Amino acid sequence: SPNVLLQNLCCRILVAQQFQYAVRVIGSDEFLVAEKIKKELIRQRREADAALFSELHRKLHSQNKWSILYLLLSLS
Amino acid sequence: AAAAANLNAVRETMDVLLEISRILNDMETLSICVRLCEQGNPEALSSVIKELRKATE
Amino acid sequence: TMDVLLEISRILNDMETLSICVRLCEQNPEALSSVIKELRKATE
Amino acid sequence: SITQLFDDLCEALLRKRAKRSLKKVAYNALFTNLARNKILMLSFDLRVGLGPKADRLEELVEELEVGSVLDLLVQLA
Amino acid sequence: DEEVAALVVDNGSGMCKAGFAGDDAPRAVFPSIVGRPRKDSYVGDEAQSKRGILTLKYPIEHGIVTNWDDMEKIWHHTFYNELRVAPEEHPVLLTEAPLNPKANREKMTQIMFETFNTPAMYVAIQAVLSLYASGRTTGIVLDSGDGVSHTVPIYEGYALPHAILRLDLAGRDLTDYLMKILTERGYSFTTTEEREIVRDIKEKLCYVALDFEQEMATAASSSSLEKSYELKDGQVITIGNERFRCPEALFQPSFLGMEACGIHETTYNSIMKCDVDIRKDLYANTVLSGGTTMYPGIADRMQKEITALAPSTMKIKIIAPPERKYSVWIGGSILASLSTFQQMWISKQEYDESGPSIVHRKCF
Ligand SMILES: Nc1ncnc2c1ncn2[C@@H]1O[C@H](COP(=O)(O)OP(=O)(O)O)[C@@H](O)[C@H]1O
Secondary structure, rough: OOOHHHHHHHHOOOOOHHHHHHHHHHOOOHHHHHHHHHHHHHOOHHHHHHHHHHHHHHHHHOOOHHHHHHHHHHHH | HHHHHHHHHHHHHHHHHHHHHHHHHOOHHHHHHHHHHHOHHHHHHHHHHHHHHHOOO | HHHOOOOOHHHHOOOOHHHHHHHHHOOOOHHHHHHHHHHHHHOO | OOHHHHHHHHHHHOOHHHHHHHHHHHHHHHHHOOOOHHHHHHHHHHHOOOHHHHHHHHHHHHOOOOOOHHHHHHOOO | OOOOOOOOEEEOOEEEEEEEEEOOOOOOOOOOOEEEOOOOOOEHHHHHHHHHHEEOOOOOOOOOOOOOHHHHHHHHHHHHHHHHHOOOOOOOEEEEEEOOOHHHHHHHHHHHHHOOOEEEEEEEEEHHHHHHHHOOOOOOEEOOOOOOOOEEEOOOOOOOOOOEEEEOOOHHHHHHHHHHHHHHHOOOOOOOHHOOOOHHHHHHHHOOOOHHHHHHHHHHHHOOOOEEEEOOOOEEEEEEEEEHHHHHHOOOOOOOOOOOOHHHHHHHHOOOOOHHHHHHHHOOOEEEEHHHOOOOOOOHHHHHHHHHHOOOOOOOOOOOOHHHHHHHHHHHHHHHHHHHHHHOOOHHHHHHHOOHHHHHHHHH
């Protein structure tokens, strides 16, 4: 299942060599992440967006979470 | 009934995640990434995505 | 060539059966795998 | 011939009556029935579970690069 | 086992093959001939042995039954003389030529149930059985026998009648052509007895040259292709370019005064008559069957010739099973032995219920 999902992600991003490299790479808290995101937003500033992000984070909890936030922060 | 409620919750969560991505900045790529993140690590996935983007360029 | 194929088969999982299977393939593949599984069940 | 090869395969899996029954079962199975990316996916699963063995399998596949045979092997696995 | 043995009978234009389903080879093979004085009727080898005092009849001369009275006698002979079984006690799988008239199929059915009282029967196309024997359900079969040759495209087990081609050029014509060129060489093979000798020379020393002209040049400037053949009286004769000139007629019928396309061109034409979506499957699965495809070198020659006719991007593969001389019979033995085929037999009950025409529905 996970391997199939990784192959689908590689296809969306784009071949076989790239998929093999991705497989090799794969083979190779929440509050802190939120604070880091706010600090990154401050560096970018801006302030209004940070307030909106705090409201959005609360909404997600109302409707694992740390891993998704970390990936988004890395993309920046 | 219960299945329909679960589908609505998933759609609402996806919309909220997309808004967060836009602020820190597609939807199909985000859905694939979210499923992979739920299974299991996060830093490694980000590195692979960055490498794939460089290859596309 | 044949020796390399045998090593790959061992990792995935005799030698005479692999040689016979290779000759049949040279002479579909999914159907052959199903037949081998059925033969193993019959032997059991 | 192809028919002779099928009989030889049945004998290896396996007195004369028993061999005939095995051949009939193989023929029935064949009637009922009537690549590189897949190998990489199997390697990724092995790496998650080991890593050295997965690297050797990838190297062997590269050396080989038949395809049909490989596919069959994968299926068997 | 609860079931009695089922019979497999391959009706050939020159030779009939009979045996029991499940066996690897036919138990008997005999000439498709019936003879009466110039014991009242002679069938098979005996008719041939005593042809001197008989008038011979060939009821299935070109693959299609033309005289049912004598065909019935051939079947009677098959059961009681060759196989030594009672037809009313065994299901019978019979073979038929490609493009066999619908009325003939009903006749065969009626004769089996009403004359021989078979408990069950079925009829399958010869080419289809040969394809089955090769482990395939899709492909094109080039069947060359004694009195006729056919190119039969088959997809998913079904022959495609619109694309089937018949070539009235086979083993018989090649035997007579060899008699003719050996006579032109300086020998003399003209009598019926001599025809049998040449047929033997043909089956033992002939071959298909990869390149006709080059082979002719080699034979003209050296004795490297010559082979000796000893007659029963001890005389040893020499066969040179006749070895490959004989079967060359399959590729160039003009050598026989025929305007027909050779076997390679006929195979190509059949494929071209099929839906474009399955042509690649046919090109990749061209199977040879029949005694006349036994010539050494024929597979490589077909590969070369088809490759020249087909698109350069096409994958061409000629399959020539070592046992192709009896692949029709073997395919029947395999089919009649299949678990899923048992429900396909036409039972005496079904025959009594629907009559002869049921064969069209049951044996599509
Ligand atoms: N080895 C061989 N080489 C060439 N021709 C052969 C060989 N063996 C048999 N034949 C020829 O094949 C023909 C018979 O083949 P077969 O498929 O049994 O025909 P049919 O079914 O029409 O009677 C005869 O003309 C015979 O001479």
